[PDB]
Scaffold this motif. Sequence first.
Motif, PDB file in Angstrom:
ATOM      1  N   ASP A   9      -9.291   4.626   1.521  1.00 55.03           N
ATOM      2  CA  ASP A   9      -9.951   5.100   2.742  1.00 55.03           C
ATOM      3  C   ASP A   9     -11.192   4.273   3.071  1.00 55.03           C
ATOM      4  O   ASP A   9     -12.313   4.783   3.204  1.00 55.03           O
ATOM      5  N   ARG A  41     -12.274   6.406  11.118  1.00 52.50           N
ATOM      6  CA  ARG A  41     -13.382   7.362  11.242  1.00 52.50           C
ATOM      7  C   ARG A  41     -14.679   6.642  11.595  1.00 52.50           C
ATOM      8  O   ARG A  41     -15.206   6.848  12.699  1.00 52.50           O
ATOM      9  N   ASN A  75      -4.818   7.205   1.963  1.00 43.67           N
ATOM     10  CA  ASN A  75      -3.918   7.639   3.035  1.00 43.67           C
ATOM     11  C   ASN A  75      -4.248   6.994   4.379  1.00 43.67           C
ATOM     12  O   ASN A  75      -3.370   6.902   5.243  1.00 43.67           O
ATOM     13  N   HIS A  93     -10.736  11.447  -1.357  1.00 44.80           N
ATOM     14  CA  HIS A  93      -9.882  12.123  -0.349  1.00 44.80           C
ATOM     15  C   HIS A  93     -10.405  13.447   0.191  1.00 44.80           C
ATOM     16  O   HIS A  93      -9.825  13.994   1.127  1.00 44.80           O
TER      17      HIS A  93
HETATM   18  C1  4TE Z   1     -13.091  14.604   6.239  1.00 45.55           C
HETATM   19  C2  4TE Z   1     -13.186  13.463   5.286  1.00 45.55           C
HETATM   20  C3  4TE Z   1     -12.818  13.956   3.804  1.00 45.55           C
HETATM   21  C4  4TE Z   1     -11.775  12.861   3.523  1.00 45.55           C
HETATM   22  O1  4TE Z   1     -12.230  11.772   4.188  1.00 45.55           O
HETATM   23  C5  4TE Z   1     -12.247  12.367   5.424  1.00 45.55           C
HETATM   24  C6  4TE Z   1     -10.835  12.794   5.596  1.00 45.55           C
HETATM   25  C7  4TE Z   1     -10.019  11.653   6.202  1.00 45.55           C
HETATM   26  O2  4TE Z   1      -9.866  10.605   5.535  1.00 45.55           O
HETATM   27  O3  4TE Z   1      -9.514  11.749   7.343  1.00 45.55           O
HETATM   28  C8  4TE Z   1     -10.490  13.168   4.212  1.00 45.55           C
HETATM   29  C9  4TE Z   1      -9.312  12.381   3.636  1.00 45.55           C
HETATM   30  O4  4TE Z   1      -9.534  11.429   2.826  1.00 45.55           O
HETATM   31  O5  4TE Z   1      -8.139  12.681   3.980  1.00 45.55           O
END
Ligand code: 4TE
Length: 325
Positions: A105, A109, A137, A261
């Motif tokens: 990640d 965002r 993801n 995550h």
């Molecule tokens: C809201 C944040 C917590 C984590 O990172 C953001 C979200 C995101 O990645 O969209 C989550 C994830 O990893 O799935």
Amino acid sequence: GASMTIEDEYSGPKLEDGKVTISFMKELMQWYKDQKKLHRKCAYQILVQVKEVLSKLSTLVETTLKETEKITVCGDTHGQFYDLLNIFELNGLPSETNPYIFNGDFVDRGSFSVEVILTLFGFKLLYPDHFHLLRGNHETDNMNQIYGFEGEVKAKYTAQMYELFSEVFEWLPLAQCINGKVLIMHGGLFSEDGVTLDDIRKIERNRQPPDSGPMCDLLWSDPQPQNGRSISKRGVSCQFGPDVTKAFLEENNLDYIIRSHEVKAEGYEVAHGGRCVTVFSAPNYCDQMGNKASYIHLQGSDLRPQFHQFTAVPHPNVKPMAYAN
Ligand SMILES: C[C@H]1C[C@@H]2O[C@H]1[C@@H](C(=O)O)[C@H]2C(=O)O
Ligand SMILES: [Mn+2]
Ligand SMILES: [Mn+2]
């Protein structure tokens, strides 16, 4: 007169014969800090090379830390480039004696995702055995399409550059095991019992994740506090309880897992009796969450996680998800 022509004088950091060096990385970080763009030919060269490097790795990276050797583990960074630089200022630049793992990640965002990912890829090329990137993801097409990264790459470069990023992300390994004792993955453990390291090594990972199965779980699952499993609140993969973690660790001769995550106000959480640790490295996530972030220190002779908390630093006035749907 010769003095009067201009070619690439003003287009920023350049690779040295197509290769990443420490000087290049320092120049790149400054260039990015100052909100400038890496020349597309350099970005391309970084991507082609890092694809080659990553494609030779196992789906499970297996790393040995000698007794006095340390490593730092970071969780989600989400295009928060100025916070990434802050990590390096708090904890030192990456090197052969200061290795890092970034646990997925990197993008979406936050609106400096290009700057984060090219900086991370540059360091992977510079210190390939001491700088580790695991897939999250968000290093996937469906997520990039909606959550900013595809828009950001198309805005800064082209659709073709984005296609190349997608191809590179497909080669990111899915998990890392240190000293046969600590397993690191972005999401978590599995929707069924009996999965072993063998199964992780066997995942043909150069693809978008399946809708269910071990590759999906590694990128998507979350711990829950009660025993057993539940269908995920996300609608993808499962929640897994402490008994799932413990059975997995015991069968695989492991001590604990580090995953990311999920955001935590304190930047980390120790769950499942110490068996499941969450680390999250994006402070004040999306400029709104107000959370601390953390990174973990580990040592060959002592693989217990030691947490270091940090807070957000200023960044330029670009809104989170500015490039998103
Ligand atoms: C809201 C944040 C917590 C984590 O990172 C953001 C979200 C995101 O990645 O969209 C989550 C994830 O990893 O799935
Ligand atoms: Mn995330
Ligand atoms: Mn995630």
